[PDB]
Amino acid sequence: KKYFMSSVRRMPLNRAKALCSELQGTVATPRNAEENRAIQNVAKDVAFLGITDQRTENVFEDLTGNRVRYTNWNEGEPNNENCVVLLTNGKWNDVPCSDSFLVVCEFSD
Amino acid sequence: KYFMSSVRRMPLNRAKALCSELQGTVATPRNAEENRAIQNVAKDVAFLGIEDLTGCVVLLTNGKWNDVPCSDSFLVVCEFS
Amino acid sequence: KYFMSSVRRMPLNRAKALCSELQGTVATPRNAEENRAIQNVAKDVAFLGITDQRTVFEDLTGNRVRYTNWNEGEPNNVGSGENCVVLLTNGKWNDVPCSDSFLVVCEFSD
Amino acid sequence: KYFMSSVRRMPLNRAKALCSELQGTVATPRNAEENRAIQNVAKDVAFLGITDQRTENVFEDLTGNRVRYTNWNEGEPNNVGSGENCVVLLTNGKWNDVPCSDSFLVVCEFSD
């Protein structure tokens, strides 16, 4: 239903959003524990998720404006433009959108 | 191997960079079946990865290949294994 | 992704509102498997979330559809901008008036 | 049984129609586990399928059967000269009675 592919280099979210979009995809956004795990397995290191507080300050939503219905915050998170990264243990950290991380793109038919 | 086409047109350089950044390469037809599958994904003229990018050419809607400059812009179809 | 069918037949406008009220949308098949899944859930002719209202058949998200399964002779235009799509019991698609009434299959996801 | 919530608030009458349209019914918790599950789908205050229209302070599900399991906030309701009373699930998981005419989120339950 969803194809996940990781980038080779680390980059800020703006470059990441543009990368996934180029091939009609989006920055990976897990809707449940299974997808979270799926993305965690393809990413070789900490990677960006398609969740930010860009539209509404300090309120996390997906790239379509919906508040996320699934989260998996690391202990102490989200700790406050805010972005989200998926750690190697699968938990989430709140980080600056300007910092660079691997990118996992999500694709569907 | 699955194929995905870009939303916009671009020169082969940017195209090779795009597919490789996501760990694939510009679609390279190995047989009539793949050439056909690649055209099916590209819904208009698109670059091919042609030696292939790892040891220019565009695929037309009729499935035939034309030799065009590596500097002009067309759609890109990336292939992933 | 899961699908649920309505009990009543209704026009596209009502269909859309119905599905969205429970955080879903009108079922929109992205491949043959999904088309089959929707086919199984609706045991009768039902609306799909595809129309030409914004033009060109697009999903209720403004994107042109990348999957279709037109019945022989379809799509037969009913009138620019008022074209909708229904899935027949055999799984093929017909182009019909958005104002006509059909069952509705809503799609939901996590 | 699986649950789904609405995006907007509405009176009980409209909620009943909404859930039935998709072959379900307004969610009715039959035990604490379901109650917790419905509250989890329903982040905010939501209607349950229980009212005392017939006899004041006696709550029945939408089929006319008096409910067994209850999780009243501050004990059983004890209204007087009241309109039809409905039940909403609060953020604390307890139940509170409110006029069926007021508007709250809806949680539908399905058995598909």
Side-chain angles (χ1 to χ4, degrees), chain C residues 57-106:
Chain C
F57 280 109
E58 281 163 37
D59 57 36
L60 307 180
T61 309
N63 302 302
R64 294 196 182 189
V65 300
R66 305 169 292 291
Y67 172 79
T68 59
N69 189 38
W70 299 111
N71 187 199
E72 284 171 40
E74 297 292 319
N76 184 52
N77 205 306
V78 301
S80 303
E82 49 189 296
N83 295 293
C84 271
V85 183
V86 292
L87 182 63
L88 300 174
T89 58
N90 65 15
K92 297 297 182 180
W93 300 6
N94 283 351
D95 183 317
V96 297
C98 293
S99 50
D100 275 3
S101 298
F102 303 82
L103 276 183
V104 178
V105 181
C106 296

